[PDB]
């Protein structure tokens, strides 16, 4: 199997297919252990945001790839923003303040 | 540094900073003002930066200083516009 | 057929939190793909399309670039008709359509928009 | 999108109010069709090939 | 003059209660109808759970009705329907609220272990706090006569008390009653009066609840949250997209359970509102309130009490809490079945053509449009979708120096994911270098690996400078090489030695490389003779460089040709003069330590190529005649069965103890098994005769099987013993051993009986393996969770103290020395020398300088060394105190990630640990790390004194020992059970043994010392690895034990509140800033406390990191009570947020941001 | 006494957290999905001190609690029903009469009637 | 498990100390469980379903 960019689930903007392409590979805890062990901060950074479930990040970084710019320009993944809304959905309030 | 890359770390301790500065230089090359120092020989910008670091040129202080000169070149040489704008709102 | 449409309203119906493959652990709502989003490839082609068109209207004249641009309404939101452009360019209707057709004649050799078609 | 309207205007519209969802053999595999089959609804115009 | 009001960068997140107005701030409208979607038009209703005006529009930029369509009105709302036409993702972020009539209690702050609403109010949970809000027993809200302040009354008591007084002590019942109860409560005045009362003339008979509640009340009052928010009156609504009802295939919608919950609570709330306007019967209204309570409690968190059903499904409904209480798929990835690739290098891997084509899609697109060929992006798409030859060449350009990292399923350690340079291969399978095939613990049974493409620039450099296979020469666990040649190659190089006498031999001498010409041209053999040649050796000393040394040594053909592979340096010849077995890795290791990276890598490739080539040239096979059985087999078996026959005959006529003849006859068959084993080995080993010059001589058998066994290559003594010898004692399901071992062997026939006996061993073997394989990772998770927060920082601090390292000697009564536990270790301070000088202060013991610790004779077997256990560091680890043990030869880079690598290395060999006064195995390791007290804990003398009996069994009691001397006595408790070890009158020292049994780590740490307890743990956890034969450095154990002793207990009087057990982090940093702040008397002295991995991991600063592993419902709640905030230095909690990791390539970013957050 | 001594003495520490044990050594109506969480929360986690926070805290159903207050019968007969209904009609009558006393209610009805006839 | 009735072991440590504690159990084909087990105090208890 191989996947560059395909479909994503409605609930969580995570890669999946079987209709035209193939659902992307799963990283996991066992792998993030290794990346932390190496110290590959940027590898894990992308693997957790733009390379996975970052709505605008994937598109922005994709355009950066086709233009031969690479870089990243990451952002807060929806797999945490949803968590913010879910916790906020209860009587408990969580806010991300500046400094 | 096609296979270590280990000979570059002793030039700047802690492999991490090595990755930072090398990615910095490679970022300068891939997009914007290219101009490599060590001959390309059909190598990606990933390794070219590592070659330079191994060569002895292009470090952290080097890039920072050249960035300072770059700023003093873009700013001081083109102040005739900024100064003219300074009189815009008195 | 009315009965057919009736059975299409029955049931709650099914909830996403229903187990299916019984993996570790499966969920019906996890197989539901999103369709409102566009492919990054498609978005890239759209951006490249904007740049392509923005670069094609450069090889045209002002009284022809603006014509094609304003008629089909691009980079200006509200698109106008033959009359609203014929009044702002003196000669009305047919004349502005003539140039509008001539511009289309210009694009029969370049391959950019040609391959962008598909 | 305006650019697409212009693009089709230069190569011919034919902007049919229909899309596309034809069954295509998945990329990678390849073989020979050995048997076709069609299960029609009870009250639908049967096809020629059917 | 900043004060920006946009979504910029954040340094921390805050968690706390939400006021009703706080809920209103998120409200973009109010849900008022249980309606969802239209039955016919399929269009969102007015004020339903899926409103368009409140939440967001269906389509992107067009409103509900259709008055406005395109981007013309993106900021203006519609006239006919107030629908803000922006995006459709707006519908995913819009909140909303429902404003209930009568107040409602939050299920979390109500019933979540401690009664948060109860403990704050000091009132029973499921007893009193239930009966007064479920409309049953009215409660009081403060009275100035007869009645107290928080007593419970019945309707009869209510009217009676109302009749006696009334109109001056009014107190309602239900939710709003508890609301006024919390609201009327003054946290401040009680915080004062409680401090006054709970300190006046009270010993240890009260202090518990006193300190507990006062700390809790102080925390809550300082938190900022008002107790009014405890029970909600306004319930917020989750965005529609996070709980949509999307039409599946041909009708049949798919909705979330939350819609059912919200619909129910809306219905019940509306009826409640309607009842409070029409006729109001007390029973009906109170019941509907309880029903509203049911709906709300079910929506927030089901749990918990019966579980609301409905929805046709017999399964419960997934509430909000159930969606956040308990695998990150990623793009640009793939996987396939692996295959060996001998022709590959060490930094290369076989990546399929079509596979790599789909992977680097965006790269191929960009490069195509960059060069030319494709006029546009879509042109490139249509060009690669139709694989048009030239595109492939472009592919060869994009994957040039663009590393791709490979990964296997069971990722135990860091070497689970290694990067390689992609090499196009005409096929659909992925090829891998056979050298790094051991790091993955991968075989070619059909296993499949996954590939990931580093997209980011610095991600490519991370994969090249860190995750590259060439950078992982040495194992992170032990300094020994990991890419060491295995079965096939080692057999090859083993065959390239093996000095055989004569047979086309003779001492025809030449000069190295020239000998190669001799080999291909036949004439001479290959394993002769020995023969002499000229070897040009190279050595260096002092001033480095290179010094030639030509000589004439007596090697063989194989050694001569193999010598060409050896790099510039090395002692030469002597590394080849040996053979191929274990020194095969030793040679690679020494080459690494004396040469460097690159020459060590190419040497590995060369020895791999040479190994495979000559292995193929050899043609070693495995026929049926390769496993020769001993002739003395039947003889030995008869002799053994003869002895056991006599024993049985004796048992028949009594004499010997028949009760245990089973054991002694087992010794008989076991002895016989060793006899057959010894006979087979002595036979299959030597043998041969040859015919040297005048004939008659003996070497060692060239019997293939023996060649494989005497050269690694998967072949042990036991297996061979079962092949030709015999399978010994077989296990029985009872756990006992059968007194009739498998006399036959695999070379021979096997009877149905003994096979039906062996099937038990195979069954339990696979079963136990399946258990310990999952149990190993089960331990690894705990190890990581407790250790994945410490990173080597602040360069190199001071300090000299550290555990005195000494060779682990069981040689007291068994003889077993190991003196390699000191290497790459930073010395404490000049550890003496039988004379003077020698060792420096902070000089790290080099690999060549540890060999200098043999020139100081066997006298010096004790050196003080700085360890991670000690170290006066604060929130990290000193670089010196750690060591250097990595794939790198130098010291650990500043800002690494010691924790995860340590945990991985420890839980890696867990797969090969056999679970069971000696437990032994994985379970033993777990018990050691958890710091659990033994089933029969020993006792020690706390203070050195005079041992004397303290009243022979006068309690209670049970013996009592009282070691009293100097000043003050002590009364320990001996429970008769188990004897003693010290008579009366005798004196003892500070921490003497007085039970002679299993020692408890708690007592050791508390009394003996930290160095002692850590030494105990490390030297006890290794002893279970010695038996299993798994090499693992002591550094990692010291690493986990470091934070295993994270917290302590202060006992005196200081700024800290005495009884509180806090970590030595804040303790040390505060005691250092108090001796020179105002006065040293404003602080107390602490005491280290031993706590297990789980107990240690339980405590952590970040509430998000805690919300990860442990019970989320608890941590999130308690963190909600007190205005806590993560800020924000942890690894785990900074991963789920999706940002740079405060370690490795990061760290510097975090350091800059950390110093940046000092302005305010 | 019973619950406290049994729970503490037995659970030391039950090794594998033998849940299916003391749950039967508890009174009241069993087989509930409520008391379950109050035991799995005490055994581990905050060991030692948690076993002291358990007793101090230990020192249910909608419909069943609805039938409880519904238990108050106060049933009626034909005489009772007619009686209560009579009081209702009496109350309504007094209210309507009290409205009749109000002259502005009459004049308003007159004004609104003229509004009705004026369409 | 075959229907009928069998006496189970439960041998070994079940409450520290370690002392037998035998128990009988009746397994119906279509009905409710009927168990009989002892305790450390040598009392007899019954489990219905
Ligand atoms: N250690 C090292 N090698 C470099 C370096 N730069 C280039 N090389 C070597 O170049 C060889 C092949 O590179 P090519 O792509 O064919 O040519 P190129 O140098 O112009 O790019 C490899 O040899 P090889 O590694 O010896 O092959 P092998 O030992 O893996 O079998 C590679 O290691 C470097 O900076 N350090
Ligand atoms: Zn509208
Ligand atoms: Zn240190």
PDB file of C-alpha atoms and ligand atoms in Angstrom, chain E residues 797 871 878 881, ligand 3:
ATOM      1  CA  UNK E 797      26.934  20.771  36.910  1.00  0.00           C
ATOM      2  CA  UNK E 871      23.717  14.704  40.647  1.00  0.00           C
ATOM      3  CA  UNK E 878      23.925  16.432  34.174  1.00  0.00           C
ATOM      4  CA  UNK E 881      26.850  12.258  35.579  1.00  0.00           C
TER       5      UNK E 881
HETATM    6 ZN1  LIG H   3      25.042  15.713  37.426  1.00  0.00          ZN
END
